[PDB]
PDB file of C-alpha atoms and ligand atoms in Angstrom:
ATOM      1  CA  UNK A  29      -0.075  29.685  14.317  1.00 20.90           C
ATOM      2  CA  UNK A  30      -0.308  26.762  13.091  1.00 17.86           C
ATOM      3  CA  UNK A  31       3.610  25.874  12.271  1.00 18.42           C
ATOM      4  CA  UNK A  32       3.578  25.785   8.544  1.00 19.74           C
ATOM      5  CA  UNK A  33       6.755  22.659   7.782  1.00 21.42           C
ATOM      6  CA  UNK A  34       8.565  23.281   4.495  1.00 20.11           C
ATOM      7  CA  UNK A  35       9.651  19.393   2.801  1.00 20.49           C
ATOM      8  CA  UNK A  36      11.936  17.883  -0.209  1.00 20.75           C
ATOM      9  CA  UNK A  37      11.164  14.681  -1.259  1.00 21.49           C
ATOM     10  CA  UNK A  38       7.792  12.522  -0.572  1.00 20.07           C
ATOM     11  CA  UNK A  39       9.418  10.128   2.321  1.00 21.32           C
ATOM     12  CA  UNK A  40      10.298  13.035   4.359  1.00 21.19           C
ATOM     13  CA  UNK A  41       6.286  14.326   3.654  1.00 23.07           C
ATOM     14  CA  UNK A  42       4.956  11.363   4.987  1.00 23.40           C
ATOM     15  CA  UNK A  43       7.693  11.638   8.562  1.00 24.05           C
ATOM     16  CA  UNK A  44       6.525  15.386   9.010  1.00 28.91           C
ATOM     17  CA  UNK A  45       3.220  14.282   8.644  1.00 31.40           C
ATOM     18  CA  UNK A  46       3.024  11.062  10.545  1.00 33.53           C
ATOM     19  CA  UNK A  47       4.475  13.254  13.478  1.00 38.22           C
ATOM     20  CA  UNK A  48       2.421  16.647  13.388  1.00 39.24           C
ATOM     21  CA  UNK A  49      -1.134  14.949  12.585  1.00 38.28           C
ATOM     22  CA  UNK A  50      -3.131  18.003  12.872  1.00 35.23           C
ATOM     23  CA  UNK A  51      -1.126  19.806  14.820  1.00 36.56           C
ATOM     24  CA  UNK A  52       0.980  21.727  11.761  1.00 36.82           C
ATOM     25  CA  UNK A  53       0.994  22.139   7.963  1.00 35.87           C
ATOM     26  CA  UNK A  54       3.151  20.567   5.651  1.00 35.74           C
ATOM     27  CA  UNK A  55       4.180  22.288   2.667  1.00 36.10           C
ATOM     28  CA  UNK A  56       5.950  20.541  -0.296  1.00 34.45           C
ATOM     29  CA  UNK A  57       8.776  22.785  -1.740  1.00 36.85           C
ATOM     30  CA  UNK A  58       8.747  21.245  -5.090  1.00 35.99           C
ATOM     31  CA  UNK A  59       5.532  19.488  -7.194  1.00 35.94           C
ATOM     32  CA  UNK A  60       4.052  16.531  -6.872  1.00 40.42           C
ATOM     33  CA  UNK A  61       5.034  15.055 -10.104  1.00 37.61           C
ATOM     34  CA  UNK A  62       8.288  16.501 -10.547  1.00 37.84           C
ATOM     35  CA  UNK A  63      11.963  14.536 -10.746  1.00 39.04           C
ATOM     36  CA  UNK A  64      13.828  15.400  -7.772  1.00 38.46           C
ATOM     37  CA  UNK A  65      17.268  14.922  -9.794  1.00 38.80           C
ATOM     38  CA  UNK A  66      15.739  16.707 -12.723  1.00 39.37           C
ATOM     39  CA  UNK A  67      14.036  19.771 -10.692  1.00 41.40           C
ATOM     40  CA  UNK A  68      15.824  23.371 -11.423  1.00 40.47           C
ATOM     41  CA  UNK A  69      14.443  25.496  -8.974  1.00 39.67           C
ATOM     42  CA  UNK A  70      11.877  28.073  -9.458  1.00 37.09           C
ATOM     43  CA  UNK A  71      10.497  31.831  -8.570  1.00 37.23           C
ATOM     44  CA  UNK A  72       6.983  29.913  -8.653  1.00 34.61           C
ATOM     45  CA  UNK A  73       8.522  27.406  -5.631  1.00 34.21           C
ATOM     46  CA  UNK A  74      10.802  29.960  -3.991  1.00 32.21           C
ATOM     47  CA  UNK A  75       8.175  32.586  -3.652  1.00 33.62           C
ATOM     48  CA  UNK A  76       6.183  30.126  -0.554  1.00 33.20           C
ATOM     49  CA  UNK A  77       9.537  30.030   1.138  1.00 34.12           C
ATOM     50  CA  UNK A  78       8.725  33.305   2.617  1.00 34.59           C
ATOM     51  CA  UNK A  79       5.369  31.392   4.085  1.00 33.51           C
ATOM     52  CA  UNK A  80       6.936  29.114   6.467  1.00 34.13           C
ATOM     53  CA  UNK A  81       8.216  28.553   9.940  1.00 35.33           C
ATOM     54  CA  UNK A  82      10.794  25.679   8.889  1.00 36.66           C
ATOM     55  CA  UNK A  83      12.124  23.640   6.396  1.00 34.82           C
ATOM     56  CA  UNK A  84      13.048  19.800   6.767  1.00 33.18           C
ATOM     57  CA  UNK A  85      16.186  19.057   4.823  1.00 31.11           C
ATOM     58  CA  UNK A  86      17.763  15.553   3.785  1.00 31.11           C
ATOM     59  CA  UNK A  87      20.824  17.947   3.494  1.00 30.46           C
ATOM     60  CA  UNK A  88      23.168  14.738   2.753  1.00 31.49           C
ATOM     61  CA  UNK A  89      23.137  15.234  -1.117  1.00 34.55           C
ATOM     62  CA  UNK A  90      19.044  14.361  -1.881  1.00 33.02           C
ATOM     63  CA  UNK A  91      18.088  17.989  -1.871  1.00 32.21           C
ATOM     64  CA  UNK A  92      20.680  20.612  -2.936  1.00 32.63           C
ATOM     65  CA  UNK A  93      18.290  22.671  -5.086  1.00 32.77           C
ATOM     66  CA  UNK A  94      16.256  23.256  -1.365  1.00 31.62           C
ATOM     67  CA  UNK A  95      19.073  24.985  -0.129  1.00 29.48           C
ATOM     68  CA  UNK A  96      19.825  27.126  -3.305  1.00 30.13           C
ATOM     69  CA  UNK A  97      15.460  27.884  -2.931  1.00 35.13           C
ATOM     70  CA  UNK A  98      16.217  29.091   0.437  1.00 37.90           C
ATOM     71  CA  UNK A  99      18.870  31.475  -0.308  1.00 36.82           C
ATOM     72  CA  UNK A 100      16.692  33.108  -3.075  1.00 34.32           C
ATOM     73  CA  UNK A 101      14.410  33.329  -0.671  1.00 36.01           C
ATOM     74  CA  UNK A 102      12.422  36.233   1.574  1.00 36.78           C
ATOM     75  CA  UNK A 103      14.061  33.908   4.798  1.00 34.81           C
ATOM     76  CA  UNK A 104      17.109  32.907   3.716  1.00 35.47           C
ATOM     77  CA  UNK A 105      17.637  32.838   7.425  1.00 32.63           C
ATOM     78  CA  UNK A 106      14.822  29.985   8.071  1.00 33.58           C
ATOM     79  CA  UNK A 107      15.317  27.352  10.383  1.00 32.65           C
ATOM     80  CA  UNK A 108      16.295  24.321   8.995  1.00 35.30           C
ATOM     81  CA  UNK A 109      15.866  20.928  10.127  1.00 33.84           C
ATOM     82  CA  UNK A 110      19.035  18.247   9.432  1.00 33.24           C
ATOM     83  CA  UNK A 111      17.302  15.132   9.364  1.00 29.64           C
ATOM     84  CA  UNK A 112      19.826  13.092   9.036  1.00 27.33           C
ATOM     85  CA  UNK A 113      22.312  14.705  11.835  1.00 29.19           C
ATOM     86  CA  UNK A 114      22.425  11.482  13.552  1.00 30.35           C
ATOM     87  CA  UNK A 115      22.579   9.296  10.487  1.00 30.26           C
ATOM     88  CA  UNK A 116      25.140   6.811  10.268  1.00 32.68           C
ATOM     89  CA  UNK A 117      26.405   7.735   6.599  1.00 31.67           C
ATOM     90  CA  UNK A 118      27.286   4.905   3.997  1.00 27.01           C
ATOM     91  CA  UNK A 119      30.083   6.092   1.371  1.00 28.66           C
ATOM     92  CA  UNK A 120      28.326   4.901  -1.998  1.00 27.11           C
ATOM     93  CA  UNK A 121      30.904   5.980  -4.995  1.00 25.22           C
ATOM     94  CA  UNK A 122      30.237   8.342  -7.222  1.00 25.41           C
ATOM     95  CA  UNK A 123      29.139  11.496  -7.728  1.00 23.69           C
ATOM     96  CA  UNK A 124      31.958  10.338 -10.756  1.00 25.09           C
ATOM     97  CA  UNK A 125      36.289  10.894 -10.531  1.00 25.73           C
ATOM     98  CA  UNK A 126      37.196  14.321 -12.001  1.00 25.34           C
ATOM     99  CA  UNK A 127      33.960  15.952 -10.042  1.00 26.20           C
ATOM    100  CA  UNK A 128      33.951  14.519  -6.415  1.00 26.06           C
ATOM    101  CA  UNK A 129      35.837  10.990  -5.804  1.00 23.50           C
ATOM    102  CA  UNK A 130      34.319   9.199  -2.693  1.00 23.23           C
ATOM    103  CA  UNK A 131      30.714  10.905  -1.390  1.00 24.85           C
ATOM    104  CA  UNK A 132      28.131   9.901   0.710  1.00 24.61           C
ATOM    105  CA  UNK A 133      24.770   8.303  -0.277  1.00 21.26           C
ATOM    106  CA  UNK A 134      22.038  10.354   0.675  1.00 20.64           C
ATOM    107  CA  UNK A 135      19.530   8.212   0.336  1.00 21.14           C
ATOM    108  CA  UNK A 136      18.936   7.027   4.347  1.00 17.80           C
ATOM    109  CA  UNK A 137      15.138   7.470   4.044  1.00 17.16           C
ATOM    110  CA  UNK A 138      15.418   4.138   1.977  1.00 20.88           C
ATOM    111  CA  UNK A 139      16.522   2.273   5.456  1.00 25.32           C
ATOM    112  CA  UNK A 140      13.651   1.796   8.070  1.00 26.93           C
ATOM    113  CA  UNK A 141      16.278   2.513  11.074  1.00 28.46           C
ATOM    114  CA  UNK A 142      17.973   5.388   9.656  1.00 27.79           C
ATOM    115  CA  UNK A 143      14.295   6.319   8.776  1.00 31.51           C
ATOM    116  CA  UNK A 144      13.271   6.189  12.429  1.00 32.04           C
ATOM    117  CA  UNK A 145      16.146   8.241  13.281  1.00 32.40           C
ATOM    118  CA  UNK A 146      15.134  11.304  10.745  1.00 34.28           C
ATOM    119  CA  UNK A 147      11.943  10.812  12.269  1.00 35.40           C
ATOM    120  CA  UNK A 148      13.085  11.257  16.108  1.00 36.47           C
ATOM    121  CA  UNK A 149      15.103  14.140  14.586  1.00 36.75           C
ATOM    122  CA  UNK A 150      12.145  15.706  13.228  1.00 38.11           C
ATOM    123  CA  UNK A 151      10.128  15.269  15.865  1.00 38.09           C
ATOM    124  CA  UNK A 152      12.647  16.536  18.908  1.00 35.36           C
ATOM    125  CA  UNK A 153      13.227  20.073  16.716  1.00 35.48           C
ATOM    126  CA  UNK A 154      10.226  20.572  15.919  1.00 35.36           C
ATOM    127  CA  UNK A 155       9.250  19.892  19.638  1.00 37.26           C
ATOM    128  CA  UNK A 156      12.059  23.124  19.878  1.00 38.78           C
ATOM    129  CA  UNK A 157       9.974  25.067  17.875  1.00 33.29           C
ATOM    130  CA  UNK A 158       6.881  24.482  19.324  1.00 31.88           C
ATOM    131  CA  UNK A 159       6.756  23.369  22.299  1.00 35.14           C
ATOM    132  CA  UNK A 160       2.859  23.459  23.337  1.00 34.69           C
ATOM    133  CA  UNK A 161       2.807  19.573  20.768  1.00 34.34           C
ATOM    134  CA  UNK A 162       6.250  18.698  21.898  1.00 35.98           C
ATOM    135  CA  UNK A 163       4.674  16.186  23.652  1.00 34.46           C
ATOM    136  CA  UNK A 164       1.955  14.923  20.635  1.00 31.32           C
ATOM    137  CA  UNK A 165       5.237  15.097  17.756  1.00 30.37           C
ATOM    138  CA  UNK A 166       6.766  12.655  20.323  1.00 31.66           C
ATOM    139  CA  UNK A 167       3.878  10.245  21.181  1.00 34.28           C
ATOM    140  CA  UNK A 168       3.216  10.421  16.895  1.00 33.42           C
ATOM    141  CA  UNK A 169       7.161   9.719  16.445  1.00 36.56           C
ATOM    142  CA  UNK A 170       7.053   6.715  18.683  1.00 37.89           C
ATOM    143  CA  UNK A 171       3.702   5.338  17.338  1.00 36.64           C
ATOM    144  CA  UNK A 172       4.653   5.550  13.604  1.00 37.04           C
ATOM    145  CA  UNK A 173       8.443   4.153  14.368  1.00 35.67           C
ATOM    146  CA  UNK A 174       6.652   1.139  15.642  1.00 34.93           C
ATOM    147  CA  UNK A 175       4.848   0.640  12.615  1.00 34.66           C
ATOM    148  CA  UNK A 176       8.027   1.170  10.489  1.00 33.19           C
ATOM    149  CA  UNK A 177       9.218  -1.818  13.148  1.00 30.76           C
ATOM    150  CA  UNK A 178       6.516  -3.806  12.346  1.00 33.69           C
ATOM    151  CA  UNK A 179       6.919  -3.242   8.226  1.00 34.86           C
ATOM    152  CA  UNK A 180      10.682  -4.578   8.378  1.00 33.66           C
ATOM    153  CA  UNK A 181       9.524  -7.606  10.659  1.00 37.75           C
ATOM    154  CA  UNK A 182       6.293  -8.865   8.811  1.00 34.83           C
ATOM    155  CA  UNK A 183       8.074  -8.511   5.664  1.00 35.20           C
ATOM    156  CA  UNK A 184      11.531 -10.765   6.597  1.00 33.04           C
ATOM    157  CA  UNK A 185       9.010 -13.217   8.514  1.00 35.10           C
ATOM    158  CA  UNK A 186       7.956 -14.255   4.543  1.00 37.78           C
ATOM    159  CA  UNK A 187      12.234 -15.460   4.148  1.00 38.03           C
ATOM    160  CA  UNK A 188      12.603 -18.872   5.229  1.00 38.93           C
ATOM    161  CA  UNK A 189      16.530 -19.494   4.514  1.00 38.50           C
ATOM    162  CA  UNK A 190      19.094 -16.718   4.075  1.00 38.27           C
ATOM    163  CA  UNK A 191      20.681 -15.635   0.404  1.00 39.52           C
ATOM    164  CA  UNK A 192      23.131 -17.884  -0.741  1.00 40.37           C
ATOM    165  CA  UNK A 193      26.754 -17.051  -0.693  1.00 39.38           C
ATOM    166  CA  UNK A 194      26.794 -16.396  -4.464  1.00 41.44           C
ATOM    167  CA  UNK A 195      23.596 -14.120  -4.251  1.00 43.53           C
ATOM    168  CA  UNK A 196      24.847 -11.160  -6.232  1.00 45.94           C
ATOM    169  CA  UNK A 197      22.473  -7.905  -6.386  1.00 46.83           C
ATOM    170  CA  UNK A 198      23.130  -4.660  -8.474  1.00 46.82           C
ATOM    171  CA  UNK A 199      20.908  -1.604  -9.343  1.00 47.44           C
ATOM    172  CA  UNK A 200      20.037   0.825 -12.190  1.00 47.30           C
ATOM    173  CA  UNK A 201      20.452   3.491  -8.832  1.00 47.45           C
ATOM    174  CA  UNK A 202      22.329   3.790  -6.450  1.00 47.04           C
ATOM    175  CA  UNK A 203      19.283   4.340  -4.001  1.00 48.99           C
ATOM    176  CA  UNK A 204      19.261   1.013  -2.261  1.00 53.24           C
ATOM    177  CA  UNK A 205      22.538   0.435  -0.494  1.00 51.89           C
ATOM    178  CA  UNK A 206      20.598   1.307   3.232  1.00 51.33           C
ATOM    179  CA  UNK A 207      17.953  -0.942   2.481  1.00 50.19           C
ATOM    180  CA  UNK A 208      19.816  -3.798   1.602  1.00 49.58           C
ATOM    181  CA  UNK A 209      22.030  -3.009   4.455  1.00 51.95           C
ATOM    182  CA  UNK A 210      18.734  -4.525   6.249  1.00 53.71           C
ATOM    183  CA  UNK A 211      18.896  -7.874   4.947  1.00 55.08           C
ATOM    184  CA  UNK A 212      22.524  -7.841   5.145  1.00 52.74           C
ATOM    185  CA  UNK A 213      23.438  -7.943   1.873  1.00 52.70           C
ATOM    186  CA  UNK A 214      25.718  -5.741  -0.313  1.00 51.35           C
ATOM    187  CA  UNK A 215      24.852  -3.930  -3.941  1.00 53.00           C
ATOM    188  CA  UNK A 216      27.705  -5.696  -5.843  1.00 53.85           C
ATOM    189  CA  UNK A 217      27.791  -3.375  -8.720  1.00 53.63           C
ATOM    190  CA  UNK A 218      25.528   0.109  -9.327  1.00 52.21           C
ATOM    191  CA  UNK A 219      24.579   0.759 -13.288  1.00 51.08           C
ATOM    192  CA  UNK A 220      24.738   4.590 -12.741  1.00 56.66           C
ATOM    193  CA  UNK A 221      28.362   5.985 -12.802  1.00 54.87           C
ATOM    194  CA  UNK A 222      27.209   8.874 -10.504  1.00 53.51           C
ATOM    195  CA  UNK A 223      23.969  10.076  -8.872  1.00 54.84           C
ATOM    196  CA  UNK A 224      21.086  10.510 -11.435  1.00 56.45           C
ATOM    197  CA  UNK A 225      23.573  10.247 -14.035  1.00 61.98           C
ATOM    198  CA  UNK A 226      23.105   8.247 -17.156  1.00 63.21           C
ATOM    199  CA  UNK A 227      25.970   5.696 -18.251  1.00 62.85           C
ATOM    200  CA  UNK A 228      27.734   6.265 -21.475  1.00 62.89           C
ATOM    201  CA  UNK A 229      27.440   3.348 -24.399  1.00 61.25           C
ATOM    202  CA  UNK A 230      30.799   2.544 -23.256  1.00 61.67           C
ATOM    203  CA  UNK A 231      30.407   2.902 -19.505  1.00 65.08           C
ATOM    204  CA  UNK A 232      27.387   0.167 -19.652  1.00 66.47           C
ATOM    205  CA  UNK A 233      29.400  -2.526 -21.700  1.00 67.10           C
ATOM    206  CA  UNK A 234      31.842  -2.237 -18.815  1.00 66.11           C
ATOM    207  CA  UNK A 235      29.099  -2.630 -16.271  1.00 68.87           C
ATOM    208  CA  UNK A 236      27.643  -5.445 -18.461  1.00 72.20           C
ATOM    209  CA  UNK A 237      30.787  -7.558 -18.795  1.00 75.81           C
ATOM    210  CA  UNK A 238      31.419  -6.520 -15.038  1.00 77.74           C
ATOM    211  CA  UNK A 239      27.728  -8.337 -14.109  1.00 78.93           C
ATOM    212  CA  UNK A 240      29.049 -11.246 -16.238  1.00 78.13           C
ATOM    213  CA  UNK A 241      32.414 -11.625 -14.645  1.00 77.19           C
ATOM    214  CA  UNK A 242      31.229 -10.898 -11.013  1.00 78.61           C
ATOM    215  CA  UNK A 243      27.897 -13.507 -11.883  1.00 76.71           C
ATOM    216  CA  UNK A 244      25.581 -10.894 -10.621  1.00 77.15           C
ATOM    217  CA  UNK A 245      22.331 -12.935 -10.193  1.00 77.65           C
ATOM    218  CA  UNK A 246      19.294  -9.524  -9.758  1.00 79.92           C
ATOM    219  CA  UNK A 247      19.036  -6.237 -11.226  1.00 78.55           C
ATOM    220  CA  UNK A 248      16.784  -3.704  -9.170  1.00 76.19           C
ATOM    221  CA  UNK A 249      15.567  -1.048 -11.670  1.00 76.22           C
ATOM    222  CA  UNK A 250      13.261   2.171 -11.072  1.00 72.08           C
ATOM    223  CA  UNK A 251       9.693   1.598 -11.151  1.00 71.06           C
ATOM    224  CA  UNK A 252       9.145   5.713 -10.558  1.00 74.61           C
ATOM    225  CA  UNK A 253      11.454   7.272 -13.759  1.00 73.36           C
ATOM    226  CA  UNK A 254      12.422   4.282 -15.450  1.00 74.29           C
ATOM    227  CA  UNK A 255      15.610   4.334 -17.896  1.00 77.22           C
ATOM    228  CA  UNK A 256      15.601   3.567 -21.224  1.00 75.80           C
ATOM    229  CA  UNK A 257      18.196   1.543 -21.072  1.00 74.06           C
ATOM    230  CA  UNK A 258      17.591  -1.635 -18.600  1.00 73.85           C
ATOM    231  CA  UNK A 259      15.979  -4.044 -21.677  1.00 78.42           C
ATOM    232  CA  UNK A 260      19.577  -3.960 -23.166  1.00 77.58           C
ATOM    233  CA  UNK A 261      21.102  -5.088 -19.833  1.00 77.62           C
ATOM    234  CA  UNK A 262      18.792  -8.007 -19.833  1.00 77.68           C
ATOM    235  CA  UNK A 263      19.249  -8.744 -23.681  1.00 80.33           C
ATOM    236  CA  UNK A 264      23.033  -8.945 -22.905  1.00 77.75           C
ATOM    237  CA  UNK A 265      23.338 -10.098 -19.116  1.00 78.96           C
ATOM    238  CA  UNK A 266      21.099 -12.624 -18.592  1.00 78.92           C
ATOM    239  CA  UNK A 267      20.620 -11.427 -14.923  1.00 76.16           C
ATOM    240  CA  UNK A 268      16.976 -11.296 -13.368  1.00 74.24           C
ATOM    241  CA  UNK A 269      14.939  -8.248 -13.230  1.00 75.99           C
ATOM    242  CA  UNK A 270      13.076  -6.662 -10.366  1.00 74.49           C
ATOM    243  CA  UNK A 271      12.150  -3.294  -9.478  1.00 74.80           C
ATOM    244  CA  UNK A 272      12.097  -1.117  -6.573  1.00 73.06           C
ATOM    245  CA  UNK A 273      10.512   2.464  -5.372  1.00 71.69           C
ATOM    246  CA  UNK A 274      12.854   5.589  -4.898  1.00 68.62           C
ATOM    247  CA  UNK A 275       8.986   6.804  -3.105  1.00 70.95           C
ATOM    248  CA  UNK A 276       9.884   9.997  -5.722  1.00 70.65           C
ATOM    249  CA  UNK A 277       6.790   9.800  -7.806  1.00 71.06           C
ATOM    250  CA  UNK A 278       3.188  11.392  -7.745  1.00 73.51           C
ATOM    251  CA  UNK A 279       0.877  12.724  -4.588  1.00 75.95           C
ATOM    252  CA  UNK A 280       2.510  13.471  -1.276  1.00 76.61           C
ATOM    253  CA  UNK A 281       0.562  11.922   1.425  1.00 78.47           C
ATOM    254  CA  UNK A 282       1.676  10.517   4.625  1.00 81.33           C
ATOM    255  CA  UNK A 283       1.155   6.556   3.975  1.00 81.68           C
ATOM    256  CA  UNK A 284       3.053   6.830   0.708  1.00 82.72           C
ATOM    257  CA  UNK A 285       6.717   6.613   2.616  1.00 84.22           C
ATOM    258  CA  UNK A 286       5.211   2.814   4.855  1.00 81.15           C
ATOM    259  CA  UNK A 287       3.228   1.659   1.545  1.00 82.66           C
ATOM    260  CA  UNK A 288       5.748   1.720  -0.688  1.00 81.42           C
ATOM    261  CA  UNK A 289       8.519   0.464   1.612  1.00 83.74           C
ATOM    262  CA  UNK A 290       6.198  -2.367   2.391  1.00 80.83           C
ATOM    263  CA  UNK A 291       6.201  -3.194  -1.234  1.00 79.62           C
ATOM    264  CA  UNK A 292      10.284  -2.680  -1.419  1.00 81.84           C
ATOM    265  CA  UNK A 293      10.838  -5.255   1.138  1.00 78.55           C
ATOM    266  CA  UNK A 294       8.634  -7.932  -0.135  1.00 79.95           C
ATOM    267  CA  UNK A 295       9.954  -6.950  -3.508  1.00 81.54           C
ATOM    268  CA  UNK A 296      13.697  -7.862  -1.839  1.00 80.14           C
ATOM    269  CA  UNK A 297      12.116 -10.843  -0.312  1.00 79.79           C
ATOM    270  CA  UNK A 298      10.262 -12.336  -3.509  1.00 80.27           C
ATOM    271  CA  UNK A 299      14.520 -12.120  -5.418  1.00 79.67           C
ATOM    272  CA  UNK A 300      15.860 -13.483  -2.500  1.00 79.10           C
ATOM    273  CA  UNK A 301      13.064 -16.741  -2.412  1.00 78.87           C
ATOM    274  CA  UNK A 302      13.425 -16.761  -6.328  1.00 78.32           C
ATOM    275  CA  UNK A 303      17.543 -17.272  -6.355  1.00 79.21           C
ATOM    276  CA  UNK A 304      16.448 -20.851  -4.912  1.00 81.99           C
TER     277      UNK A 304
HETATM  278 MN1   MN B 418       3.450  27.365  16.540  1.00 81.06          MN
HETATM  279 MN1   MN B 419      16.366  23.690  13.560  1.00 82.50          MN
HETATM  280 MN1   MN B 420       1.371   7.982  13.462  1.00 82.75          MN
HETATM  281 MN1   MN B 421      24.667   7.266  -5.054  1.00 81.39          MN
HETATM  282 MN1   MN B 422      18.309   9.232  -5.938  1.00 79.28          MN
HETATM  283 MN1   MN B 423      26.127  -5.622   4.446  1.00 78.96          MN
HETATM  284 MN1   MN B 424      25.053  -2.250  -0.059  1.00 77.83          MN
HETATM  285 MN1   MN B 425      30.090   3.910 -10.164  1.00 77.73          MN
HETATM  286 MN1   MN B 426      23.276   4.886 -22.495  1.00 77.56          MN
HETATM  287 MN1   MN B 427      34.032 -10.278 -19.099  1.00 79.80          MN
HETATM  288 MN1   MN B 428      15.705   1.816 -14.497  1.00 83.57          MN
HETATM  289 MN1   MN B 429      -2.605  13.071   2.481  1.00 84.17          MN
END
C-alpha cells in the first residue's frame, strides 16, 4: 500500500491523477516521448507490469499494445479498468476495407463529456479497489469534472455567431470527431485512410480533389507528430490550416490533459471566428 495505477496514453495520466492526488501512484506503461501508434512493446515496459495493482485501459482501439504488455506479463491476470464502458461510441471509418470495414473511434478522451465519463469510471473502480479513498477519488472526480465544465464553457463563451452552413472541417487524423461533436459540427472528410496510417500518393489526390469538390473550408493537422505531407495539401487545396493536440507528446503530468484541451477549443473557436 499505496495502489500503484498502471496508464496508456497522457490524457488518461492526467484523469488517474486528478482523481488519486496523493492517495496512489501512477505508473506510465509506455515513455514519455514515445508515439503511441508507433510503440512495439517491450521486455523493458512489460517487466513493471508485475509492479502494479491495476491498469487503466482506453480498450476501444487507442491502446492494443497495453493489452498484448499484459499478457507477457508476471499478472496477466491484473485488473483492468475499461474506461470507456459507458462511452457512447462514434463509428469513424477506417481502420481501411480489406482489414476491418466500419470500427469505432477510440479517441473519446478528445470529448470533455465522454472525458468526464472515463473519469467517473475511473474513479468508481478504483473506489472498488480501495475503498478506505473511495470517498477522496469521488470528491477529486467531481472537482476536476467541474473544471473540465468550466474549460468547454469559457472557451465557446469567445463564439459570438454559430458556423455557417457551408463551414466544412477535415483533419490530417481522425482524432477529432468527439470534440467537434461539441460544437456540433461534423469532420467532412479525414486525410488518413485508416488509424495512424499514412495515405498513398494516390489516396491524397483523391482526398485533395474530394476537399475541392466538397469546398472544405479548415484543415486540422497534428501539432504532436506532424506529417510530412500537409504543405502539399495546402499547395494544392487552398483550404486553411490549423492545428490541434492528440495530448500524445512529451511529460505526463496531470494538467497536461485540461491545458491542452483548453488550447484545442480556442484553437476550434479562433477557425470558426476566422470563416467570417
Ligand atoms: Mn490500497
Ligand atoms: Mn476493474
Ligand atoms: Mn482535482
Ligand atoms: Mn479513426
Ligand atoms: Mn490517434
Ligand atoms: Mn454533429
Ligand atoms: Mn464529426
Ligand atoms: Mn477514410
Ligand atoms: Mn504520401
Ligand atoms: Mn474534383
Ligand atoms: Mn499533420
Ligand atoms: Mn506531474
Amino acid at each position: 500500500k499505496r495502489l500503484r495505477i498502471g496508464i496508456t496514453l497522457h490524457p488518461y495520466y492526467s484523469y488517474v491523477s486528478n482523481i488519486v492526488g496523493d492517495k496512489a501512484e501512477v505508473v506510465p506503461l509506455i515513455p514519455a516521448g514515445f508515439n503511441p501508434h508507433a510503440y512495439e512493446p517491450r521486455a523493458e515496459d512489460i517487466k513493471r507490469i508485475g509492479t502494479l495493482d491495476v491498469v487503466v485501459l482506453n480498450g476501444v482501439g487507442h491502446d492494443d499494445f497495453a493489452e498484448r504488455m499484459i499478457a507477457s506479463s508476471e499478472k496477466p491476470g491484473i485488473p483492468v479498468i475499461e474506461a470507456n464502458a459507458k462511452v457512447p461510441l462514434l463509428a469513424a471509418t477506417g481502420m481501411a476495407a480489406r482489414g476491418a470495414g466500419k470500427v469505432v473511434n477510440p479517441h473519446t478522451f478528445l470529448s470533455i463529456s465522454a472525458s468526464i465519463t472515463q473519469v467517473n469510471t475511473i474513479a468508481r473502480e478504483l473506489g472498488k479497489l480501495d475503498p478506505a479513498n473511495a470517498k477522496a477519488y469521488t470528491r477529486n472526480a467531481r472537482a476536476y469534472a467541474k473544471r473540465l465544465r468550466a474549460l468547454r464553457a469559457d472557451a465557446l463563451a469567445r463564439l459570438n455567431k454559430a458556423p455557417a452552413a457551408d463551414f466544412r472541417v477535415a483533419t490530417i487524423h481522425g482524432a477529432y470527431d468527439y470534440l467537434l461533436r461539441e460544437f456540433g459540427l461534423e469532420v467532412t472528410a479525414v486525410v488518413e485512410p485508416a488509424h495512424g496510417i499514412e495515405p498513398s500518393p494516390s489516396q491524397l489526390k483523391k482526398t485533395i480533389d474530394q476537399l475541392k469538390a466538397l469546398d472544405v473550408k479548415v484543415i486540422f493537422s497534428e501539432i504532436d507528430f506532424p506529417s510530412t505531407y500537409v504543405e502539399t495539401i495546402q499547395r494544392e487545396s487552398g483550404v486553411k490550416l490549423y492545428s490541434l493536440s492528440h495530448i500524445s507528446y512529451g511529460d505526463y503530468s496531470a494538467g497536461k490533459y485540461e491545458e491542452e484541451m483548453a488550447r484545442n477549443l480556442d484553437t476550434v473557436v479562433r477557425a470558426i471566428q476566422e470563416s467570417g
